[PDB]
Design an enzyme around this catalytic site. Sequence first.
Site, PDB file in Angstrom:
ATOM      1  CE1 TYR A  79       1.116  -0.490   4.368  1.00  0.00           C
ATOM      2  CE2 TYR A  79       0.440   1.798   4.280  1.00  0.00           C
ATOM      3  CZ  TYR A  79       1.102   0.773   4.915  1.00  0.00           C
ATOM      4  OH  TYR A  79       1.756   1.015   6.099  1.00  0.00           O
TER       5      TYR A  79
ATOM      6  CG  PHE B  10       0.486   9.639   5.294  1.00  0.00           C
ATOM      7  CD1 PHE B  10       0.392   8.454   6.003  1.00  0.00           C
ATOM      8  CD2 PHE B  10      -0.591  10.035   4.526  1.00  0.00           C
ATOM      9  CE1 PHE B  10      -0.741   7.673   5.928  1.00  0.00           C
ATOM     10  CE2 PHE B  10      -1.727   9.256   4.452  1.00  0.00           C
ATOM     11  CZ  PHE B  10      -1.801   8.074   5.152  1.00  0.00           C
ATOM     12  CG  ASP B  11       3.188   4.434   5.878  1.00  0.00           C
ATOM     13  OD1 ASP B  11       4.387   4.207   5.618  1.00  0.00           O
ATOM     14  OD2 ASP B  11       2.494   3.686   6.596  1.00  0.00           O
TER      15      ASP B  11
ATOM     16  CB  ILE C 235      -7.830   2.711  10.137  1.00  0.00           C
ATOM     17  CG1 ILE C 235      -7.137   2.521   8.791  1.00  0.00           C
ATOM     18  CG2 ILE C 235      -6.916   3.425  11.114  1.00  0.00           C
ATOM     19  CD1 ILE C 235      -6.954   3.806   8.023  1.00  0.00           C
TER      20      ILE C 235
ATOM     21  CE1 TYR D  28      -4.316   6.344  13.019  1.00  0.00           C
ATOM     22  CE2 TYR D  28      -4.674   6.681  10.683  1.00  0.00           C
ATOM     23  CZ  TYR D  28      -4.010   6.051  11.710  1.00  0.00           C
ATOM     24  OH  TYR D  28      -3.034   5.125  11.428  1.00  0.00           O
TER      25      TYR D  28
ATOM     26  CG  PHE E 188      -4.736   3.986   2.201  1.00  0.00           C
ATOM     27  CD1 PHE E 188      -3.470   3.737   2.691  1.00  0.00           C
ATOM     28  CD2 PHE E 188      -5.658   4.607   3.022  1.00  0.00           C
ATOM     29  CE1 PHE E 188      -3.132   4.099   3.978  1.00  0.00           C
ATOM     30  CE2 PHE E 188      -5.327   4.969   4.308  1.00  0.00           C
ATOM     31  CZ  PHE E 188      -4.062   4.715   4.787  1.00  0.00           C
TER      32      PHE E 188
END
Lengths: 783, 49, 107
Positions: C26, C36-37, C56, C82, C99
Amino acid sequence: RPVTSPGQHLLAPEDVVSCCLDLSVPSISFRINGCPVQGVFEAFNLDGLFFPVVSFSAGVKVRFLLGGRHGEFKFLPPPGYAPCHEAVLPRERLRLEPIKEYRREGPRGPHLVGPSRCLSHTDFVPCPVDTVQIVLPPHLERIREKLAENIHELWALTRIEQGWTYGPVRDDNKRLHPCLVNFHSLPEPERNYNLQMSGETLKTLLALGCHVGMADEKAEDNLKKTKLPKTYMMSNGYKPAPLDLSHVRLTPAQTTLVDRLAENGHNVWARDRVAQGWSYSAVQDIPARRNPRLVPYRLLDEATKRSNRDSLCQAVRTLLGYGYNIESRWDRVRIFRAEKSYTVQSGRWYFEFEAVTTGEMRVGWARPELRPDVELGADELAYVFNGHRGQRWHLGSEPFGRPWQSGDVVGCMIDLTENTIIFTLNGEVLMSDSGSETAFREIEIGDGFLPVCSLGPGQVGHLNLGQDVSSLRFFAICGLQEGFEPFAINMQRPVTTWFSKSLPQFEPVPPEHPHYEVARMDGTVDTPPCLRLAHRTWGSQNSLVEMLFLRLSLPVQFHQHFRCNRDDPEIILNTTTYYYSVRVFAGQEPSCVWVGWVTPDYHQHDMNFDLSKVRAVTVTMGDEQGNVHSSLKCSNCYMVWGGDFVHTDLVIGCLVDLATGLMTFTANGKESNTFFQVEPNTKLFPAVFVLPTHQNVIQFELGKQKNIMPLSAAMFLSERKNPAPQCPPRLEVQMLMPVSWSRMPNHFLQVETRRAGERLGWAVQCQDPLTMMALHIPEENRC
Amino acid sequence: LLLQTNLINYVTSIRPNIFVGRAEGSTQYGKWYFEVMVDEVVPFLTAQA
Amino acid sequence: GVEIETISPGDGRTFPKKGQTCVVHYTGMLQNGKKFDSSRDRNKPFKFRIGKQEVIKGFEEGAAQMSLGQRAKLTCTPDVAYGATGHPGVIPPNATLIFDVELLNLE
């Protein structure tokens, strides 16, 4: 922008993409695997030429299908569309090339390449001198007749040499022609056409400014005709007898006159055919009204240019035989220099520069503070040698040496102990006019010196810093015994190079700019903070007057999601509308001021800017059968013209609502008709485009209106709920600068292009990956 | 506020030497067509698409 | 909720069942475009098992609808990603997340 297609998926192997370009109504359409894609670009600019292009990263293998003898089309083109292979120019062969490359591989190393000359859309319009003006000189009527007669004799000779013979009805297969008769025996309409054509040769000579007049009254009765053998006799007794013009010699001006007479005649015929509705095409198609040679004379094949040229040469020689006498600015030079970390302040150094071409190229030594927008040698920051014509450049030009030829190597040697610079050509030391063996002397050390070179358009050069001593071709011949060393001897990696990139960028106005001054005015009780621009050299000699592109340093960002004299505290605390105004002082022409916003991707910098040059495009979406449901409009400049609102200052105000994407303007308190709509994530910079005409030009007023917050509330998070206007130091005026220094990458992608076959088309292949670490500036959205 | 860093791939463009356009009195045709066939694409040669 | 936009078709027959371990790659980015990731930078597929509140909610809701080999975009709303508190130092409050998810294997 997402688009809907049957079976949406990313491009996968065995996929064929068909691209259609229609210019009658600007549109670009796509088809994937035969299924139409419900989305079209339209209403775009037409200021240039369009070419197919594919962009790709490492790991691809694609094939271009262009039709005809090249890649056969898998699907039939839509009616009326022509294959792209028909657009190849007569003088050019189809090939695959990069776009504006500044570097290429060569036998012995990288070759630096200058700017490439590109054609324009105006180069395909025929422009004949043909004007309504008529000459009809009574003194040239006799020679019109004699000229037509000799042209006929020459024509008939050319036919008869190629096996043509007389017959009353033309037959191309048997090569029978009815015009193989005495001139006087032609049908009257054919005689008249010939006389008209002879007359138009004469009239075109006169339109080209030629003086045509009798000079030798004896010449005509001394003319003889060529006597051909009986094998040139037709069955009707006609044998051509053109004049023997073997004694005639065109002067240079007359040769030039022939070269000019033929080009104009071809252009007039071309424009006549265009008016008749024909269009240029390799595959001649009479029913389709397509002709391979329906192009202007500048771009024609030499075979036909020489053919048509010879008939006109014989026309001019006939006249003589009868006794007549007949009598952008910045994307041009590309500068390459070494990095400042290699600055040398002592010793003796050597390097070579090979001139692949012979055009405009300069090479030498420059100081670290070299300016990218100034030609080398025009100032005191460079000592260069111009090899197109042997010259040395430092604060001016003076003769030095001799011009070079293709393949010549120039050896630049600098001696910091004797403070001298020596240039050598092919191992031979260049010589001045006064016998001085040194080009420059008494050079100050200062910061140091760096190797530098500049290339004009279409120029290729090889720079050798001497990392491999064996690669040098004349170092041993001249330089070795004098104590000179290669500039890059004992170095693990190649020297990094910087080049002058001609991409306009916004930069802060220098505090010491000779012409432009910016004053920060504090906000009084009755006035808000202002940024006033003034011209500090208006009216005096050497004053610079040109288009100025200004913007504020900080943008306003629209919200991510859109909804479906005393200020009111709840309205002012819940409003999303922001205001700012620009005051154009009295004396500055409103017709030369444009006020509005610019997106961060504005790099136009046009010296003849108008609102018609602003880039625009409409993206239209529809369903499987039409039913337009979305039509977005995109542009990078949203401005209004000051000439639409015409001894008093003019204060144009701009209002933006961040919660709806709506932008409006006010002129002297009166609402304007123009408005704009933008997308949720848009960033807009306040910008003014102005041509100065007075000492006081403009003034950014960062004020506010009733129930409307100032700009600082949107630019600064800590002031979101502060209605008090502020002008923090970070907010400043930036001007658009044309050129900047850029670092050359160490490695480049290896792309393999080849013709896979007649039916497979042209193949592009790339495998080797490359990655760089990019530093991104958030507010400017650039890296 | 702070500057951001990330690794990105190099991208190159390739074009044929065919130029078409529209102008008043021009001899050029208005409608053009071409095809591109994809033979091999690696979805992820590196961390970036 | 969660919206799914397919980018590469999967097998379309084998869906994640209760108890199976899914192994995916992902890339998680914000709505403004900032990344961010990304597991690909670590060069290690992320492994998780279905139905055990290990991730999540939106992420597993999207992955549950994906077939073997499919590549898809997952959009997650703040109310499930979140919530209001976000993630200290990494994700600001009320952030809608994007995502890029590829389902590599199950069990």
